[PDB]
Every structure is written in C-alpha cells, then in structure tokens.
C-alpha cells in the first residue's frame, strides 16, 4: 500500500574540519616535509568528505548513503588518533533537530557541541534516516526492491538502536529530543517492524504456505503494536507516525487471521474459518473508519467479505459447523525474520582510513 514511515535527515552547519586538524599535525610533526604534508592532505580530504556527506540534502541512492557511511567510518577511526578527548582541538558541530521545527518566537531547535561523539551520533542518525528513505522508496512488487528494503530497514533499526545505547555517554550535555534514547529507541522498533513487514510481503509474493504467512504477519503486528504504544503519550515524531503504526498493527493482525483462515479451510475447519474471517473483517472495518486518510484497505476488505460471505453461505446450508468464539481459538504463532543490524566499523564498503599510517 506504499504507506511506510521514513525519517528526515538532520541539518548541520558547514564546518572547516581541516584547519583545527593540520594545526595539530604541524604541531606534533615539525617535519617540513611529506608526512606532515600527507596528513594535511588527508585532513583536507576529510573536510571535503564532511561537506559531501552532510552538506548537500540530495540523492536517495546508494552513493549518497555510502558517502554518509564512509564519513561515519572515518570519524570513528579518528577519535583515538587525535587528542579530541581534551578540548585542545577546537571543533564545534552544530546540528538541528530532525523533528522539532521550533516555534516562530525562538528560532529553530539547534544544538552546538565541541564533541566528536556528538558528530558521530548525528551522522549515524542520518545514515539510518537516509537508509529508511531508500527502503521506503523501493518497488515492493520486485524481489530486488524487497531485498533492498529488508536490508535497509534492518540497518536503520540497528543504527537507531546503536544511538540509543551510546548517545548519553558520548555527549557532555543532554541531546536534542530527536537523538535522545527514547526517540531513537522508538525509531529502531518502527524500522524493525517495517523490515518484518517486508518479509511478509516477500512471503506473500513467493506464494509461501499460508501457515507461515500468518506467523510472519502476526509477528509484524507485535512490532507495530509495541511501536505505537511507545508513541501513545508522546508527540515528538511527526503527526502521521502514530495513526500509521496503529493502522499497520490492525492490518497485520487481519492479515494473520486471513491467512490462518485459509489454513483452517484447507483443513475443513469451516467454523474456525468463519470466526477468523469475521475477526479480520472487524479489524479492517475499524481501520477503514479510523485511519481512512492514512491507508487504503478497500481491496483487502472486499477479499475478506467475499470469502466470509461464501463461507457462511456454505456453512449454513451444508456443513453446519459451529462458529467458535475468538477466545476459544488457538493463538496464531509468531515468526521473526529480522534483527537490528549491529554497527561494526567499517559499515561502508571498501573503506580506507585516511589516517591509517598514524
């Protein structure tokens, strides 16, 4: 239905990385030769890399993501090489909140810190955000598009989760709300839910066993449900996130019941088939009336009600199966195909540290 959540990238002001870095290189290496000149060169290339990674808000393709990924790898590889733990290298990174646009009475919501850990955290945020945007753009009617989305949602999930676990010790002060552990923990779960949904779409497209499709859908329902519960009392994410999560929780439960009902029919459990279709119809009716402007469930609704009408007609006239109450049905199982991908530098392809000989 192409109703996937993605995250906007954080904006940052342009910073001259070169000057504060080579000024230390000229200090520690009084050699007026080529080692000082090659570091100074690599420092010039690092400042250029920052401008390419976070200065141009463009290009939802892998080249832009790999540039972001490469710049994250480079910064992580530099914290030990340069005395950044002490504030003798003056470098201030200013980043704006990804979500809080700010009232027109106090400007935008910005934070400036002289911290590499702050820069790492915001850069990793944009890696995850851009990955979520690339995943959300994939054609899910194509197997390669599905695989790209599955990989990128799991990456985004693991990167938001890495920020959750490290942002506090990395920052001296308290972060903006967008990178705060509560926000990125919820984003991590949203991306994990969407990765699981992609596996459900993959299973449906490949015509897998309905028993398996039901367990994949049921697990996606659990992830969407957990995510929307973390948004229930928070207004930090954009307005459309909460209704979309609530809708997807119910759509996934309905998909689980629908595919479980097909299994029931195949087993000649006609009463159970009707009970599960009635539950799917109820869930889809609730989504159609509450979240109408966020999802389109008309085709699914017609499929359910065509199946439920035929089931009831034949059961009343032929089989006379008792239709069980929902609470007397056995629970649908759960199958999780997704994991939050850990961030292990290097996360970029063919990475080469610019300060490796140091």
């Amino acid at each position: 239905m192409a109703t996937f959540i993605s995250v906007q990238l954080k904006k940052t002001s342009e910073v001259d990385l070169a000057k504060p870095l080579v000024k230390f290189i000229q200090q520690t290496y009084p050699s007026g030769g080529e080692e000082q000149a090659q570091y100074c060169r690599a420092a010039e290339e690092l400042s250029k890399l920052r401008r390419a990674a976070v200065g141009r808000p463009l290009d939802k393709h892998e080249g832009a993501l790999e540039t972001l990924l490469r710049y994250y790898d480079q910064i992580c590889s530099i914290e030990p090489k340069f005395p950044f733990s002490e504030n003798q290298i003056c470098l201030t990174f200013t980043w704006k909140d990804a979500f809080d646009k700010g009232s027109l009475f106090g400007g935008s919501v910005k934070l400036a810190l002289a911290s590499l850990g702050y820069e790492k955290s915001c850069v990793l945020f944009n890696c995850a955000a851009l990955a979520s945007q690339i995943a959300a753009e994939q054609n899910l009617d194509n197997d390669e598009g599905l695989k790209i989305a599955a990989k990128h949602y799991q990456f985004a999930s693991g990167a938001f989760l890495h920020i959750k676990e490290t942002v506090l010790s990395a920052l001296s002060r308290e972060p903006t709300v967008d990178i705060s552990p509560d926000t990125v923990g919820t984003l991590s779960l949203i991306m994990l839910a969407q990765a699981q949904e992609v596996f459900f779409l993959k299973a449906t497209r490949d015509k897998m066993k309905d028993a398996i499709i039901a367990k994949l859908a049921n697990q996606a329902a659990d992830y969407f449900g957990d995510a929307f519960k973390q948004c229930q009392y928070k207004d930090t994410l954009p307005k459309e996130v909460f209704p979309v999560l609530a809708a997807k929780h119910c759509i996934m439960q309905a998909n689980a019941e629908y595919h479980q009902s097909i299994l029931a029919k195949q087993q000649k459990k006609f009463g159970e088939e009707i009970a599960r279709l009635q539950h799917a119809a109820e869930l889809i009716k609730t989504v159609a009336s509450r979240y109408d402007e966020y999802v389109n469930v008309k085709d699914f609704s017609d499929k359910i009600n065509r199946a439920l009408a035929a089931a009831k007609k034949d059961n009343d006239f032929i089989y006379h199966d008792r239709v069980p109450d929902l609470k007397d049905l056995d629970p649908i199982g759960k199958a999780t195909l997704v994991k939050s991908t850990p961030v292990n530098v290097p996360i970029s392809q063919k990475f080469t540290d610019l300060f490796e000989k140091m």
Binding site: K147, A150, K151, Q154, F199, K202, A203, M208, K209, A211, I212, A335, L337
Partner: peptide
C-alpha cells in the same frame, strides 16, 4: 514449514 522459514532467512545475501 520450519525449512520454509530457513530458506526465507537465507535470502538477505
């Protein structure tokens, strides 16, 4: 079933 899940798991390659 169980092997159907295993083949789906080995997909992201």
């Amino acid at each position: 079933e169980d092997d159907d899940i295993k083949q789906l798991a080995a997909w992201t390659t």
